């Protein structure tokens, strides 16, 4: 199956992070250490994503890859190059200080360019063209996902996808080519305004937004559908849908199996936070893959697949606090091998699609999820109220 | 004096961890990083030791040495090689999925062997023969230890040692040579099924169990003897004895001084835990040794000895939580130089053998232990009740 | 402007840490890792600074630079070379075990020298001479600092400076040359007892104490002046003055800008601690500088300055606990881009000199500090009571 590019996932997550429910525009930020996600941040009303990551990580930002949905300002860029980040990837549409409003906006962008010149860190654009079948593969698997088939069992998806397309190009894309060229002049991307580089960048950006709208619509705000019980209190539906699209994006990094499963872990601290996500903070993410260092990565072969929940718990940037409410979002029903790990790790809530619940396959089982105690299970369904 | 090897200590601690008081058999696990113990785990009713270590450490298992009392199954092995462990050492008697019950047990064992082929991590048997005088040295020093002499001052030890030999041979050894050969073939140890390698492995296994039964009997469940006050509530006697044997095993890594002292630090979390040890979790361990990076390691020379308690507090894998109940188990009375460190570190309880309490020797003193306030002191003695 | 060197700052901070308000003399200790301060410790009634740092850091002392205000004893030195420190710097005066009282004191010093010979770590005197204009620059800028100018608005400073010179010379310097030679004879500094090395060491020692007495007097205990509101409860005035002199010393590491700003972050844990500072523990420190790894460090150029508060929050050795009271001490009023960072980081209290509060300069503003909510602001002023 086609696999989402590893830097394209980080670019897509930063765009999705900007859409996290809550002159200067909101920015999503993905912090990546050792090519593993260690931070998912969004701008707040008071602080920018780059300044939030400095508070959250500080000197731990050393040798980290930062993926911005908007080019960071001079104040943000100086603080992260001071922290020691190596790569700063940004989505080249409109920076933090909007250029579509200003003399100050151009001045700040000009100061960013000369800060980049006099610095070791690399401020660049790391979005890649997708595989020829990648968009169609995501579009087909978004029909077949748990959350869309659940609604079907009880045409709508295509309508929902089209509205997300119009909304997301309105936010992440500059429709007017002349405005985009002026932005690329201002943010030091002069090499990308000459064809075919201008058209290639614009088509690559539109392809990534089309894929993002496809994935976001696969967990849609359709009717009263949401995550309900089937602490014990559920997350807000807008937040729960957002974290499931995160896990769904992670599910497209799977290439070792025919079906991609994605998992993301989020926790809610019992205190005020500076992040735009609020008390919500990222814990860990993972997808279905083979063990790192194994020959499979380079009886059925599925037995050695590391599941999405296992990878999320393995490469976690934060510890699970017993006092805090922690959530794991799995694109499928957690299996008989993953449920004990989730309960053992202390995760309070499970948000998953229970299409395969109670099923016993040849090499995987989903029997322990139905009879799970001590962990709140929220599944995609109509509101019981 | 004869010194226990590091791998032999780690192998013995994994066997001892399986005996931690609480088709698939229980497994003890020792996690070692940079030749320092960072985790002492045992299998629980719900999770295996390998799965527990993934929850406890996760990506921190990278380049960690894992010592299993039983060969881990395919689910455990794939997760730890995915985590990044380099060397997996197991006791070659009976794996997690018991082969003495099965087609599934053999099938899982065969799947483990081709993970070892298709992976970077090393699944080996780091078991070594003991020194010629090591067993006799341990047996002699077990007479002279504080806990045996405390009972003597108030023939029994040899009887206690003999029962542990029968019990531990029945648990960690395959007495029948034919079943042991079948296990070794099934777990990919065909090179150890031919003499003299078969006899050498079995004799070395029996030597390690005989030493383990000697050490375990030195802190015996004899009469009403235990650790009593002489938070503030004591540990369960079975747990306290187990942690003292851990420290006693660490005491045999000492070679810089004629007398070996061992210390281990354990704490109780105020929440549910997935480990087979329950809320108990390992904090740090150490023994009497010279400073690392000194000519002594490679004015009396004892004043340069780093004591067991100091080494335990130095190379601690966990921080001491003020809200938690933390315990240190010292094979002897803590000295006037270690008691301030234990109190300063915030350790709530001290379990020790106070044979030398109130004594002023040349390079060591034991006056501050008797007059210590703010720390609970539990010593080996008869129950005052 | 003249700039204080790193080793001289660490040496001066260790001497200042000895003066932290609360046979064997009190010792201040600075723990430095990767040229960043990760620990500010002082001796307590029960424990020494070297033993406290072992409790505070343990194995994290590996490859750490330890700066002592007095030469550590044999017990302290063995534990820190065992922990793995790569360099021990001490103030070449009366050591931890005072030699001005003793056969035991001389015996311990001989044991320290023998341990140093048979060990990898370097026990040295990293004291350096100051720049020719360094003392006069500090003396001039101490007139112009916020705290001295605040009192002037509401001759006194020179009198206060002279008493600190007499007090600090009596504490950190050996006035008699004969006793100082005997100390240097005993502590293995035989090469510093011959002129001009003896006179160079003594003159450099007196120069550092004169600079320290100049910085300390710039935040003096003059009349009722202190830090008052203008949790919510203020620190003790002696503690607050001490931490601001720490930040003021950090302000003299600034050379990128004509005016030096320093910031230090301290937190108070809600539990007993072994340190001589009590529940107070060091969090982070910083000064005004250009980003690390930038051409500026090796559109106005001040826009790229990393402020003292931003550097303190970036290179912090501890996290800001929401339940704890955390304090930041800034030598000047925090600017409009540092106040959001301080509030975002969760720092409860700000101690600063609000000379520039409410001022709007070309490239810096101080408008958000006056209208700050949720953070306690304590400024240098007379007691309102
Ligand atoms: Zn910004
Ligand atoms: Zn699974
Ligand atoms: Zn297993
Ligand atoms: Zn001791
Ligand atoms: Zn000392
Ligand atoms: Zn500032």
* C-alpha span between C180 and C174 (Å, rounded): 6
* C-alpha span between A13 and A213 (Å, rounded): 12
Query: What kind and span of H or E run contains A264?
Result: strand A262-268
Query: What kind and span of H or E run contains A286?
Result: strand A280-287
Beta pairing class for A28-33 and A36-42: antiparallel
Q: Which of B366, B259, B256, B364 lies closest to B305, judged by CA?
A: B256
Task: Using alpha carbons, list the distances in angstroms from residue A40 to A168, A282, C366.
Answer: 19, 6, 31
Q: Are C328 and C349 in contact (CB under 8 A)?
A: yes
Pinpoint the residues of chain B covered by CATH 3.40.140.10.
6-129+165-218, 225-382
DSSP A170-239: HHH---SHHHHHHHHHHTT-GGGSSTTHHHHHHHHHHHHHHHHHHHHHTS---TTEEEEE---PPPPHHH
Give B166: exposed, middle or buried? Use CB within 10 Å, 0-12, 13-18, 19+: exposed
Query: What kind and span of H or E run contains B110?
Result: helix B103-117
Residue with tokens 């151009």, as numbered in its chain: A106
Query: For the domain with range B6-129+165-218, which CATH number is right: 3.10.25.10, 2.40.70.10, 3.40.140.10, 3.30.300.30?
Result: 3.40.140.10
Q: Are B81 and B117 in contact (CB under 8 A)?
A: no
**Which chains reach chain A with 3 or more Cβ–Cβ distances below 8 angstroms?**
B, C
Counting one residue from B and one from C, how many pairs have CB atoms under 8 Å apart?
A: 82
3-state secondary structure of B5: coil
CATH homologous superfamily for C225-382?
A: Cytidine Deaminase, domain 2 (3.40.140.10)
Note the helical H segments in chain A.
6-18, 49-56, 74-83, 103-117, 134-143, 146-152, 156-172, 177-186, 197-217, 237-250, 308-314, 339-345
Beta pairing class for A376-382 and A349-352: parallel
Q: How far is B341 from chain C (nearest CA, A)?
A: 7
**Which chains reach chain C with 3 or more Cβ–Cβ distances below 8 angstroms?**
A, B
Alpha-carbon Rg of chain B, whole angstroms? 21
* Cβ contact A303–B84 (<8 Å): no
* Cβ contact C84–B293 (<8 Å): yes
3-state secondary structure of A256: coil
- DSSP single-letter state for residue A310: H
Counting one residue from A and one from B, how many pairs have CB atoms under 8 Å apart?
A: 85
Q: Which residues of B touch A (CB under 8 A)?
A: 46-47, 51-52, 54-55, 58-59, 74-75, 78-79, 81-84, 107, 110-111, 115, 117-121, 269-272, 274
Q: Are A360 and A174 in contact (CB under 8 A)?
A: no
Beta pairing class for A325-330 and A349-352: parallel
Q: How far is B289 from chain C (nearest CA, A)?
A: 10
Q: Are B83 and A314 in contact (CB under 8 A)?
A: yes
- DSSP single-letter state for residue B119: S
**Residue from C35, C37, C256, C291 whose CB has the most chain A CBs within 10 Å, to mutate:** C291
Query: What kind and span of H or E run contains A262?
Result: strand A262-268
Dihedral of CA atoms C287, C291, C294, C297 in degrees, nearest 10, equals -10
Q: Which of A137, A154, A147 lies closest to A331, judged by CA?
A: A147
Label each residue of chain C as H, E or C. CCCCCHHHHHHHHHHHHHCCCCCECCCEEEEEECCEEEEEEECCCCCCHHHHHHHHCHHHHCCCEEEECCCCCHHHHHHHHHHCCCEEEECCCCCCECCCCCHHHHHHHHHHHHHHHCECCEEECCCCCCCCCHHHHHHHHHHCCHHHHHHHHCCHHHHHHHHHHHHHHHHHCCCCHHHHHHHHHHCCCHHHCCCCHHHHHHHHHHHHHHHHHHHHHCCCCCCCEEEEECCCCCCCHHHHHHHHHHHHHHHHHCCCCCCCCEEEEEEECCCCCCCCCCCEEEEEEEECECCCCECCCCCCHHHHCECHHHHHHHCECCCCCCCCEEEEEECCCCCCCCHHHHHHHCCCEEEECCCCCCCECCCCECCCCCCCCCCEEEEEEECCC
Q: How far is the CA of A306 from the centre of ligand 2 (A)?
A: 8
Q: Please state the φ and ψ torsions of residue A315, each to the nearest 5 degrees.
A: -95, 75
* C-alpha span between B328 and B331 (Å, rounded): 10
Residues of chain A with Cβ-Cβ distance to C323 below 8 Å are 271
Note the helical H segments in B219-348.
237-250, 308-314, 339-345
3-state secondary structure of B232: coil
Q: Are C39 and C17 in contact (CB under 8 A)?
A: no
Q: How far is the CA of C269 from the centre of ligand 4 (A)?
A: 29
Q: Is the dihedral of CA A81, C294, C328, C146 positive or negative?
A: negative
Q: How far is C55 from chain B (nearest CA, A)?
A: 6
Q: Are B127 and B71 in contact (CB under 8 A)?
A: no
Task: Using alpha carbons, list the distances in angstroms from residue C153 to B201, B306, C227, C229.
Answer: 86, 57, 16, 19
Q: How far is the CA of C40 from the centre of ligand 5 (A)?
A: 16
* C-alpha span between C27 and C30 (Å, rounded): 10
* C-alpha span between C14 and C39 (Å, rounded): 10
Q: How far is C307 from chain B (nearest CA, A)?
A: 32
Residues of chain B with Cβ-Cβ distance to A337 below 8 Å are 75
* Cβ contact A81–C293 (<8 Å): yes
- This PDB structure is determined at a resolution in Å of 3.1
The angle that helices C237-250 and C6-18 make with each other, rounded to 10 degrees, is 170
Residue with tokens 């040794």, as numbered in its chain: B289
* C-alpha span between A342 and A345 (Å, rounded): 5
* Cβ contact A83–C314 (<8 Å): yes
Give C64: exposed, middle or buried? Use CB within 10 Å, 0-12, 13-18, 19+: buried
Residue with tokens 């999503």, as numbered in its chain: A28
Fold of C6-129+166-217: Cytidine Deaminase; domain 2 (3.40.140)
Which residues are within 8 A (CB) of B287 and not within 5 positions of it... i.e. 6 or more apart? B250, B251, B253, B254, B260, B261, B262, B263, B308, B311
Q: Which of B275, B55, B96, B25 lies closest to A341, judged by CA?
A: B55
Residue with tokens 């009740």, as numbered in its chain: B385
**Residue from B43, B58, B318 whose CB has the most chain A CBs within 10 Å, to mutate:** B58
Residue B322 CA to its chain's centroid (Å): 25
* Cβ contact A111–C303 (<8 Å): yes
Q: Which of B281, B276, B289 lies closest to B264, judged by CA?
A: B281
Q: Are B253 and B260 in contact (CB under 8 A)?
A: yes
* C-alpha span between A285 and A280 (Å, rounded): 15
Residues of chain C with Cβ-Cβ distance to A84 below 8 Å are 292-293
Q: Are C366 and C357 in contact (CB under 8 A)?
A: yes
Q: In what order do the strands lie in the sheet with B122-124?
A: B36-42, B28-33, B65-68, B87-90, B122-124
Q: How far is the CA of B337 from the centre of ligand 5 (A)?
A: 10
* C-alpha span between A55 and A100 (Å, rounded): 29
Which residues are within 8 A (CB) of B124 and not within 5 positions of it... i.e. 6 or more apart? B87, B88, B89
Task: Using alpha carbons, list the distances in angstroms from residue C198 to B74, B97, B282, C92, C169.
Answer: 69, 73, 51, 11, 17
Pinpoint the residues of chain C covered by CATH 3.40.140.10.
6-129+166-217, 225-382
| Ligand sitting nearest the alpha carbon of A75 | 1
3-state secondary structure of A32: strand
For residue A28, whether the previous peptide bond is cis, meaning omega lies within 30 degrees of 0, is: no
For residue A367, whether the previous peptide bond is cis, meaning omega lies within 30 degrees of 0, is: no
Residue A327 tokens, joined: 């959530």
Q: Are C231 and C346 in contact (CB under 8 A)?
A: no
- DSSP single-letter state for residue B312: H
* C-alpha span between A184 and A186 (Å, rounded): 5
Beta pairing class for C280-287 and C262-268: antiparallel
Residue A74 tokens, joined: 């001079």
């Amino acid at each position: 199956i086609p696999r989402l590019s590893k830097v394209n996932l980080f670019t897509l997550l930063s765009l999705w992070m900007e859409l996290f429910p809550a002159q200067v525009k909101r920015t999503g930020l993905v912090v990546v250490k050792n090519m593993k996600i260690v931070g998912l941040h969004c701008s707040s009303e008071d602080l920018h994503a780059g300044q939030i990551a400095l508070i959250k990580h500080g000197s731990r930002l050393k040798n980290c890859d930062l993926y911005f949905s908007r080019k960071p300002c001079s104040a943000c860029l100086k603080m992260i190059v001071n922290a020691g980040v190596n790569r700063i990837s940004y989505w080249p549409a409109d920076p933090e200080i909007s250029l579509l409003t200003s003399e100050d906006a151009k001045l700040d962008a000009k100061a960013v360019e000369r800060l980049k010149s006099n610095s070791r860190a690399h401020v660049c654009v790391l979005l890649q063209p997708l595989v020829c079948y990648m968009v169609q593969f995501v579009e087909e698997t978004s029909y077949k996902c748990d959350f869309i088939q659940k609604i079907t069992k009880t045409d709508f998806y295509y309508e929902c996808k089209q509205e997300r397309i119009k909304e997301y190009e309105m936010l992440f894309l500059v429709s007017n080519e002349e405005m985009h060229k002026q932005i690329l002049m201002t943010i030091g991307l002069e090499n990308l305004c000459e064809n075919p580089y201008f058209s290639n960048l614009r088509q690559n950006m539109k392809d990534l937004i089309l894929l993002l709208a496809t994935v976001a619509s696969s967990v849609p705000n359709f009717k009263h559908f949401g995550f309900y019980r089937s602490h014990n209190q559920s997350l807000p539906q807008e937040i729960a849908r957002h974290c499931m699209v995160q896990a769904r994006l992670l599910a497209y990094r799977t290439e070792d199996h025919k079906t991609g499963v994605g998992a993301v872990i989020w926790a809610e601290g019992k205190s005020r936070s500076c992040d735009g996500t609020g008390a919500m903070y990222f814990v860990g993410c993972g997808y279905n893959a083979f063990p790192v260092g194994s020959e499979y990565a380079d009886i059925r072969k599925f037995r050695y697949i590391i599941h999405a929940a296992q990878n999320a718990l393995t490469f976690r940037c934060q510890e699970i606090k017993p006092e805090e409410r922690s959530m794991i979002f799995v694109t499928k029903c957690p299996c008989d091998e993953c449920v004990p790990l989730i309960k053992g790790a202390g995760i309070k809530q499970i948000y998953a699609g229970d299409v395969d619940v109670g099923k016993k396959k040849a090499d995987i089982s989903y029997m322990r999820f139905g009879e799970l105690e001590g962990v709140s299970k929220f599944t995609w369904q109509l509101n019981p109220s």
